[PDB]
Design a binder for this molecule. Structure first.
Ligand code: 9KX
Lengths: 240, 11
């Protein structure tokens, strides 16, 4: 029951992800070095990771079918609101259940709760974020499902400042329908059971996560010296 | 709306 257009969409999203997500993490050498010794010692390194990750997310978004039809202003508002959420989603691929940390192929680039804390973020974001990663990890999505969830997250009609809500909604619905149809046709029970609903529930968790991130960003960002450590893209996207 | 870097990357 999976249409040719739907398989097309999946092929494109997979490729787009492959182009935007490097499982070697080779580019991490370019970031300011991580410092675990010290308040905000990880802030420069993780600010660079985030900023880099924002770029990669933008490049994935552009590849999504129908995203280009949207106005530039609509494209900007969608990316601005979703950026953090997609980064949290995409981060699942580095996240490991064994040690509860994000493992990027090296001990230096292996990030735990204390490293995140060293970035200036409270347990109020981090505890629910780790839970999110565990629950997402538990789902064991196919890669196809992962890429589709990211795309559906970016193209959301209810994001603040959207103008063409009717059009953003039409794009999303095609991707949602593609996902629903994929699970049914390609995803075997029992893992399939309630999988779409569970994935949609992850999008709601991401909104909460986003909201908290904003608050902690606003506090951290509010002091000038901490804001100095950030990148210019981070300042623009997350607000100056 | 004052997002030059984002607009450029988007383009
Ligand atoms: C290419 C990848 C993803 O884009 C991302 C990766 C990890 C994401 C992490 C691991 C460390 C904690 C982070 C960075 C969270 C915190 C709350 C965060 O946003 C940091 C902000 C720091 C600002 C200075 C959000 C995503 C979290 C590594 C890799 O899989």
């Amino acid at each position: 029951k999976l249409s040719e257009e739907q398989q097309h969409i999946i092929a494109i999203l997979l490729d787009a992800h492959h182009k935007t997500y490097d499982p070697t993490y080779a580019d991490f050498r370019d970031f300011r070095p991580p410092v675990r010794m010290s308040p905000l010692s990880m802030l420069p390194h993780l600010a660079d990771l985030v900023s880099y990750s924002i770029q990669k997310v933008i490049g994935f978004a552009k590849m999504i079918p129908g995203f280009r039809d949207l106005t530039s202003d609509d494209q900007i508002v969608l990316l601005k609101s979703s950026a953090i959420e997609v980064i949290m989603l995409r981060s699942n691929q580095s996240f490991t259940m064994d040690d509860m940390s994000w493992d990027c192929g090296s001990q230096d680039y292996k990030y735990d709760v204390t490293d995140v804390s060293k970035a200036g973020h409270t347990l109020e974001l981090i505890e629910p974020l780790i839970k999110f990663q565990v629950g997402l990890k538990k789902l064991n999505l196919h890669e196809e499902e992962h890429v589709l969830l990211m795309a559906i997250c970016i193209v959301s009609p209810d994001r603040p400042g959207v103008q063409d809500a009717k059009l953003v909604e039409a794009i999303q619905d095609r991707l949602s329908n593609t996902l629903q149809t994929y699970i049914r046709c390609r995803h075997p029970p029992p893992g399939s059971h309630q999988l779409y609903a569970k994935m949609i529930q992850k999008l709601a968790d991401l909104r909460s996560l986003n909201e908290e991130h904003s608050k902690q960003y606003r506090s951290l960002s509010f002091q000038p010296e901490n804001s100095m450590k950030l990148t210019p893209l981070v300042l623009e996207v997350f607000g100056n | 709306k004052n997002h030059p870097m984002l607009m450029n990357l988007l383009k």
